[PDB]
Amino acid sequence: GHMGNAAAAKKGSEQESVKEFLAKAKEEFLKKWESPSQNTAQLDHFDRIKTLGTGSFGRVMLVKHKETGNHYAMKILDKQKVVKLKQIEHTLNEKRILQAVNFPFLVKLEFSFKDNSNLYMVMEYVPGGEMFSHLRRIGRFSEPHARFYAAQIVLTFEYLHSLDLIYRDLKPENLLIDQQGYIQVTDFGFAKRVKGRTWTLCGTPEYLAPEIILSKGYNKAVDWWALGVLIYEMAAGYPPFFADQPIQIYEKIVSGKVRFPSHFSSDLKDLLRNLLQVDLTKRFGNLKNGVNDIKNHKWFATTDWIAIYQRKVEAPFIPKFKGPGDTSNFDDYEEEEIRVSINEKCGKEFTEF
């Protein structure tokens, strides 16, 4: 067979130890999920420095804690705008998830609080910027470099899926690089805790699984499809399905055809054909062997999964770091005032925050 006795025993033991870790991780998650933390700081504890990112979600600002001098990334949401965009449940759920999870590649929520006007999530500052920026600048990542990042996503999805969390928002724009070169996942607005199927049309066109496009009920296998898209884009420099307009992207996604650059290794192409598998009964991550079909694939043969989890692998790329508070890996944004009305707004809606 493929493994002799020693290798088979070692793999079996490793897989059993993952089960044991995940059982404990779930116990710990459920305690925090059922009794979430609230109101662990306030606004005047922080100096506001610079806007790191903006969007319909609100903004994220680099802030400095006045006593410790520690920097953090503060997400600011306007309660009235959240209500208007129909994002109450997503916003409450994101904060509830972030305060309950614990994994080395998931950003930590260090404080949260609210005031009359806004909600505030104070997260660790991840100073390396978006994977997106590095990927577009470098062009494409070597297979070893792509693999190092992919392994972290595999472990992160193994963890989240064990908690019945579907992620649904994977793309290089949503992955940050930390000072040691490891990934941080930050956005949980589209994540959902569901054991079976769900139906919402959500995500980013290039990363949508066929079953989402086709208005089917779908499950956690959409995250494994999205991993295939991410690995492809990291290694090629462009995603597997693109076009001028989303409708044309969706036609290609559902077609069952993908083409690969000539520099992709055979191992990489085989992994991607099994992740970018339109037939759910055949997609890796969705079979009886679960995540092990991915972790044991030849493309990952050199990956030491425990060493990745322990952060003991030397990263292939370290972002430039000019010190605490350095924002050079993020774009520049127009700075806008932070208004706190004298009158409480949308109080009942956000009682749980």
Binding site: F132, R136, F190, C202, T204, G237, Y238, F242, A243, D244
Partner: peptide
Amino acid sequence: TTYADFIASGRTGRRNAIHD
């Protein structure tokens, strides 16, 4: 080429999710 097609797509920048 595929790369040129990607540039021509106009989708080389940060991509919004559907809800946006």
